[PDB]
Amino acid sequence: KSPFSVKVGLAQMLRGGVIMDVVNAEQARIAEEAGACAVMALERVPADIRAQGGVARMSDPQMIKEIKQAVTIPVMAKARIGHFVEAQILEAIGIDYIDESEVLTLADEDHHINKHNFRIPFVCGCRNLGEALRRIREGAAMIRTKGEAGTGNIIEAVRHVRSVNGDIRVLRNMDDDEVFTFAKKLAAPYDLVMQTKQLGRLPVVQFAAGGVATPADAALMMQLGCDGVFVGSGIFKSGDPARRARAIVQAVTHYSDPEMLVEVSCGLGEAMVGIN
């Protein structure tokens, strides 16, 4: 019944899905046709931001509108961390989600966007449970790992998923009397720590993000417990984007089916090169 619960419910519709970064309408159509649950509209994917440098900002509303016109699935877009006016603009465009993203150039070193001031749901990144809960308290309706975006290397995403999931599991059997100190150690709001304890999971949808390059990577994130995956660079920086996009979608939908994972991985073409 609360406005936040409605936002949380909206993000829950993306469960089981792949969200694909797209830089134009053609890629948006490829993503939707491959079965993406949503597209992330942006002018440069993380691998290109990482390689090219320069300040990375909110994308031009015109290019976001073109992508939004080109698909029927939900459209997300990125705002710089702390750049609440970029978020105001994105919301006024009429898109479905805002990603307050560390992949763009940090705009406010000390504060994130007060996301409760918006009608549109936000996704935020995290490396650990305390960070996830702090973003949620600011009003994020959806959490993803940060991983190491644009590297094609899942090691940090695995670290982040295992960190969040591990500390959630720690909460299950924890002495209630020890949770106050745990919340302090996490620098997380105690009421959200307690809610996570009661739920046995994050109070919002939890996606894997950062470095997902192969169907195996994506199914690994789902088997670790994520609700879905972002793929920013691994699809359209690969040798066969449309096929790999479908492959990753199938891997997320059928993550427990090794026969399917073989089938969609077989002859998939060159994955993104990435950085170790």
Closest CA to 202 of 157, 144, 146: 144
Q: Is 269 annotated as a binding residue?
A: no
Single out the residue of 56, 71, 149, 235 in contact with a copy of itself (rule: CB under 8 A): 56
- Minimum separation from the CB atom of position 81 to a copy of itself (A): 9
Q: Using CB under 8 A, which of 4, 190, 240, 253 touches a copy of itself?
A: 190
Return the amino acid letter for 267: G
Q: ∠ at Cα 217 (159, 224), nearest 5°?
A: 50
Closest separation in Å from C-beta 236 to a copy of itself = 17
Q: Is 212 in the site for a copy of itself (CB under 8 A)?
A: no
Q: How far apart are CA 153 and CA 220, in angstroms?
A: 13
Using CB under 8 A, pick the residue from 71, 75, 77, 158 that binds a copy of itself.
158
Take residue 101 and report the two structure tokens written for it: 């993203």
Catalytic hit among 7, 68, 78, 115: 78
**Binding test (CB under 8 A) with a copy of itself, winner from 24, 165, 195, 253:** 165
Residue 185 is among the residues annotated as catalytic for this protein: no
Per residue in 28-57, is it b (16+ CB within 10 Å) or e — as a string? Answer: bbbbbebbbbbbbbbbbbbbbbbeeeeebe
Give the number of residues in contact with a copy of itself, rule: CB under 8 A. 82
Instruction: Examine residue 25 and tell whether it contacts a copy of itself (CB under 8 A).
Output: no
How many CA atoms does the CB half-sphere of 249 hold within 13 Å? 19
Tell me the C-alpha distance between 177 and 165, whole Å: 21
Using the rule CB under 8 A, is 13 a contact of a copy of itself?
Answer: no
Residue 151 binds a copy of itself (CB under 8 A): yes
Task: State the DSSP H helix or E strand holding residue 45, giving kind and residue range, or none if neither.
Answer: none
CA–chain centroid gap for 186, Å, is: 21
Per the annotation, does 232 bind a ligand? Answer: yes
Residue choice 13, 51, 199, 273 for contact with a copy of itself (CB under 8 A): 273
Enzyme catalytic residues? 78
Binding annotation for D-glyceraldehyde 3-phosphate: 162
